[PDB]
Design a protein around this ligand. Structure first.
Ligand code: GTP
Ligand code: GTP
Ligand code: VYT
Ligand code: CA
Ligand code: MG
Ligand code: MG
Lengths: 426, 436, 155
């Protein structure tokens, strides 16, 4: 289990995707031209997981860039690491989706899906032992949401034995007050429950709340939100990219984190939280398990953890981490299920991220994520009851029953979380 | 001389195998390139060390061993390590993708891609034997390869080598150093499917070894290197009777006769003493009576359990070093005057004794001090059922909710196999209760 | 049937066509199959100029469709602040209740339209109004952890 094929779709998907590549290239000693300028040998040991080795010892990301809007390719190209991407890997349509999930999934998006798959095949056939795929996208728009889910399903048919992992950005009216976003997110969640193995839930509501209330930023921008996203994506991919006392991969993460197939939506967390251009182990373990440090706007103290994986980065006593992690599980004992023994796993990585000596990343599978799904469901139902803008969807060949089916599946998902939150060992 | 083949499966079996063969080389005077200057017969022989080492016409002594793993990382460390020239390169077999901590992947889907190659390579070693007695199989309970692939391998070895003995060294999981949440599932599935195919199995509880490293060796946070060096010391003590001259446990059949009264209760408890830190080089030398009393203390056991809570069915004491037989007789006589040592009424209350007069060897870089006398006690006691109950309870907590079950069913395994495995464990627990 | 063409023009935002149809006798209070009027459509699709034109030509600012939705409920749901203000200046019932027990306040709170929430409260929206499930707009803010909305409702 080595290589991962990364796909980024739509505006949000490409913006957070570009930031991911900039952050991890800096960690691995890769410059914007593709050359290795690092000093530690630990940076190249598992470089093959995200990069293809090329002529003149040049490292090129195994990244495919997709969007129905052609203007997105230019913003990506104008970035610092915009020239590191392979020119054949850019697949861009002529007209966007205009926040219409039906255009992304059934009409414009369906015309461009065979072209993307051709590039995925070329990247996959050049892998010695492909682990699976990672997609970055928003659920509120039309391309990342509608076309992204179509791509996930088509990849699933061609590679059913490989892992499918998404970094999916959940909408919030605090960042984007577009009323059709709950429709697009609900239709997408219906697809993600069936077709992905693991989804990191990155919530624009929590991202905005952290910038505004914790970082004191009065008018948070996309750049401020994406700083929290890139630190999180760096943290949760640490053990795929660095050796460590574990040989982690996407399938071992799934087998140990997902006890029920539909319950594969993770709540990521990060400590310390910092703003752009701006710590002890017990403090890190504390902050890590605090609602203010979660990237999904849910209070973990309102539910129960089924499973947790934590990654500490930097130089610290491995015995101290074991002691503090043991302490948090004893004093917060009622917030963990009793019927999954030893459900908390820790890893320590020597290399910390940029600008920090200490950092902790949290990956929780908690029943409290039902609060995120209920927030979107209540907004979907408010719009859907009045049939507001429904013609924008049905006019692209969508049946009205697709909405009822997505709503019913999401409410079923919420009920499933509640069932295990109330389950006891006896 | 009757040959023994060792098979090392998955990371735990491979890493413990590396540490064992390093120790065996130091005990027999074999260099990392295979040369043995004390072996006067070049190109072959019928000496006791020949049970574990074949010989080439060039005087190279090669382990009768196979290393198998579904991914290559761990075996690649053996291919490039200190003892890289010792093993037969075709003796180190690796796949490309591991079982992802899933018994069903190791047994039914990924494991099937390499099972025939492994059997053909074992056949080549068996063909070089004049009187093969059987196999020593090393593996974890918790890994997908260690659990699933080992079960598949043990099933095939029973078909192709019907009259040969099979002994296991199994690593029982502990929370302190475990890899996966599903290790209780893998442990119960492999136990169920291997039970009828194994003649004797020595369980090594990672929590027991971890506590000994912390308490006796002053190791704050023991790693796999520290655990494996202690485990290899114990494994060497158990296999010494097969590799040197002696009058106890001289062949695989004798382990079954001496330690296994009935085929299903084939899990002896090993105890070892003394374990002394290397920083205490000038330690006072413990007598035969002191090391012998130490075998009845729960802190020195390889499996966490309380033998005062159970009954003994067999007890063997294997000494190494400066040990006068009359001192063993007197030390044992004092042990018989202790009410917390009860045998079942249907077994003779005797202790079997074997003495090897060479002290144990220490590995350079190890954590152990040199000692002039050491002992390994092997006993079959009903108190080991406590280890099974602990594992069975963790299985029941998850299985009652069917947590993680979908990963096994999705890899060609029926859901009913979990119930059939658990029922077999409930009957195994009752077998210990029926004895006492 | 000019009423049917007036419904289409109000939804599409064709100001000129609305004036022409009204000048030729089109029913400003015509309804589609679900009881939606030209005013409901102009307010749903954000056509401010059409809302003002219809209101000066006899549109019932409190018309209800078959689900009890008024133009104010739709404007508050979709988030058209300027239309909400025009409707309130022309006599819209701030506390009108639809078949789900929802008032305009409930819909603006659900969709996170905080500026509209403030406007409604300033015009006498009832914070104790319960929907068919017993929820007030404050209950919605608490249950969803919307601290910004909860602060506004307490002011
Ligand atoms: N955190 C974050 N959210 C973003 C970013 N860009 C867009 N979004 C959110 O993504 C949603 C809209 O999705 P987009 O990615 O803009 O749309 P798209 O996938 O390009 O689809 P169309 O434009 O309809 O073809 C809204 O919820 C935005 O708030 C970004 O860089 N960061
Ligand atoms: N004592 C000891 N235990 C080990 C060692 N390596 C792994 N373990 C234990 O073995 C279990 C995990 O199984 P592994 O052997 O790593 O897995 P595997 O057989 O390679 O199987 P997959 O990786 O799942 O294909 C856990 O209970 C670990 O603590 C080792 O070197 N020594
Ligand atoms: C509850 O039990 C467990 C849960 C998860 C387990 N490990 N899973 C991983 C996999 C990773 O790869 C992405 C990690 O990188 C982010 C990773 O970082 C620590 C851990 C293992 C478990 O026994
Ligand atoms: Ca010889
Ligand atoms: Mg766009
Ligand atoms: Mg392994």
């Amino acid at each position: 289990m080595r290589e991962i094929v990364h796909i980024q779709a739509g505006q949000c998907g490409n913006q957070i995707g570009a930031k991911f590549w900039e952050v991890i290239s800096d960690e691995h000693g890769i410059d914007p031209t593709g050359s290795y300028h690092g000093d530690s040998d630990l940076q190249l040991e598992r470089i093959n997981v995200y990069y293809n080795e090329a002529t003149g010892n040049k490292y090129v990301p195994r990244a495919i860039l997709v969007d129905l809007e052609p203007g997105t390719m230019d913003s990506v190209r104008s970035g610092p690491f915009g020239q590191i991407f392979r020119p054949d890997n850019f697949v861009f349509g002529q007209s966007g989706a205009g926040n219409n999930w039906a255009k992304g999934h059934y009409t414009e998006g369906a015309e461009l899906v065979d072209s993307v798959l051709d590039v995925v095949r070329k990247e996959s056939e050049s892998c010695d032992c492909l682990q699976g795929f990672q997609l970055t996208h928003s659920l509120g728009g039309g391309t990342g949401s509608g076309m992204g889910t179509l791509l996930i399903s088509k990849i699933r048919e061609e590679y059913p034995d490989r892992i499918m992992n998404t970094f999916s950005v959940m909408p919030s009216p605090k960042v984007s007050d577009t009323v059709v976003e709950p429709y697009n997110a609900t239709l997408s969640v219906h697809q993600l429950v069936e077709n992905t193995d693991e989804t990191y839930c990155i919530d624009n509501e929590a991202l905005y709340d952290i910038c505004f209330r914790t970082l004191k930023l009065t008018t948070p921008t996309y750049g401020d939100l994406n700083h929290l996203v890139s630190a999180t994506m760096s943290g949760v991919t640490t053990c795929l990219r660095f050796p460590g006392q574990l040989n982690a991969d996407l399938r071992k993460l799934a087998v140990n984190m997902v006890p029920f197939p539909r319950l594969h939506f993770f709540m990521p967390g990060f400590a310390p939280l910092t703003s752009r251009g701006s710590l002890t182990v017990p403090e890190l373990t504390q902050q890590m398990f605090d609602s203010k440090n979660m990237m999904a706007a849910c209070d973990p103290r309102h539910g129960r953890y089924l499973t947790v994986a934590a990654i500490f980065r930097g130089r610290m006593s491995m015995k101290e981490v074991d002691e503090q992690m043991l302490n948090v599980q004893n004093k917060n004992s009622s917030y963990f299920v009793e019927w999954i023994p030893n459900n908390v796993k820790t890893a320590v990585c020597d290399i910390p991220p940029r600008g920090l000596k200490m950092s902790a990343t949290f990956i929780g599978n908690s029943t409290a994520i039902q609060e995120l799904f209920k927030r979107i469901s209540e907004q979907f139902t408010a719009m859907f009851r009045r049939k507001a803008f429904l013609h924008w969807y049905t006019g692209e060949g969508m049946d009205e029953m697709e909405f009822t089916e997505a709503e019913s599946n999401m409410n079923d998902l919420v009920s499933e979380y509640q069932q295990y939150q109330d389950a006891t060992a006896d | 001389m009757r040959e023994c083949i060792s098979i090392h499966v998955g990371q735990a079996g491979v890493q413990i195998g590396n540490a064992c063969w390093e120790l065996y080389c130091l005990e027999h005077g074999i260099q990392p390139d295979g040369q043995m200057p004390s072996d006067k017969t070049i190109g072959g022989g019928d000496d006791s060390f020949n049970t574990f080492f074949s010989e080439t016409g060039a005087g190279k002594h090669v382990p009768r061993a196979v290393f198998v793993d579904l991914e290559p990382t761990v075996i690649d460390e053996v291919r490039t390590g200190t003892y890289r020239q010792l093993f037969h390169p075709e003796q180190l077999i690796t796949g490309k993708e591991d079982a992802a901590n899933n018994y069903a992947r190791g047994h039914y889907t990924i494991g099937k891609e390499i099972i025939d190659l492994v059997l053909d390579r074992i056949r080549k070693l068996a063909d070089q034997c004049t009187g093969l007695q059987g196999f020593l199989v090393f593996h974890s309970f918790g890994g997908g390869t260690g659990s699933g692939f080992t079960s598949l391998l043990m099933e095939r070895l029973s078909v192709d080598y019907g009259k040969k003995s099979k002994l296991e060294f199994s690593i029982y999981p502990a929370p302190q150093v475990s890899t996966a949440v599903v290790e209780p599932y893998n442990s119960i599935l492999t136990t169920h499917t291997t039970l009828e195919h194994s003649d004797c199995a020595f369980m090594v509880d990672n929590e027991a070894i971890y506590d000994i490293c912390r308490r006796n060796l002053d190791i704050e946070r023991p790693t796999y290197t520290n655990l494996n060096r202690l485990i290899s010391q114990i494994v060497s003590s158990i296999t010494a009777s097969l590799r040197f001259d002696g009058a106890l446990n001289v062949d695989l059949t004798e382990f079954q006769t001496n330690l296994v009264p009935y085929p299903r209760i084939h899990f002896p408890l090993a105890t070892y003493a003394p374990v002394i830190s290397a920083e205490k080089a000038y330690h006072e030398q413990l007598s035969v009576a002191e090391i012998t009393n130490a075998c009845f203390e729960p802190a020195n056991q390889m499996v966490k359990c309380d033998p005062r809570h159970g009954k003994y069915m067999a007890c063997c004491l294997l000494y190494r070093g400066d040990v006068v037989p009359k001192d063993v007789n007197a030390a044992i006589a004092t042990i018989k005057t202790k009410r917390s040592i009860q045998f079942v009424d249907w077994c003779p209350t005797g202790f079997k004794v074997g003495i090897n007069y060479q002290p144990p060897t220490v590995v350079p870089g190890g954590d152990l001090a040199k000692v002039q006398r050491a002992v390994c006690m092997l006993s079959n006691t009903t108190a080991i059922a406590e280890a099974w109950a602990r594992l069975d309870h963790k299985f029941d907590l998850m299985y009652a909710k069917r947590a993680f079950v979908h990963w096994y069913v999705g890899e060609g395994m029926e859901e009913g196999e979990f119930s059939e495995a658990r029922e077999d464990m409930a009957a195994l627990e009752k077998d210990y209760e029926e004895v006492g | 049937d000019l009423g049917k063409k007036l419904l289409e023009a109000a939804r599409a935002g064709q100001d000129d066509e609305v004036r022409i149809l009204m000048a030729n006798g089109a029913d400003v209070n015509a309804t589609d199959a679900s009881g939606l009027t030209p005013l409901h459509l102009a307010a749903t699709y954000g056509h401010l100029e059409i809302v003002e034109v219809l209101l000066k030509h006899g549109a019932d600012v409190n018309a209800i469709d078959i689900m009890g939705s008024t133009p104010l409920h739709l404007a508050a749901l979709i988030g058209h602040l300027e239309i909400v203000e025009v409707l309130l200046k022309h006599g819209a019932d701030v506390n009108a209740v639809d078949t789900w027990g929802d008032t305009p306040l409930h819909l603006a709170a659900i969709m996170g339209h905080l500026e509209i929430v403030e406007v409604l409260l300033k015009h006498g929206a009832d914070v104790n109004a319960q929907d068919k499930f017993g929820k007030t707009a404050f209950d919605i803010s608490i249950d969803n952890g919307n601290e910004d909305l909860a602060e506004i409702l307490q002011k």
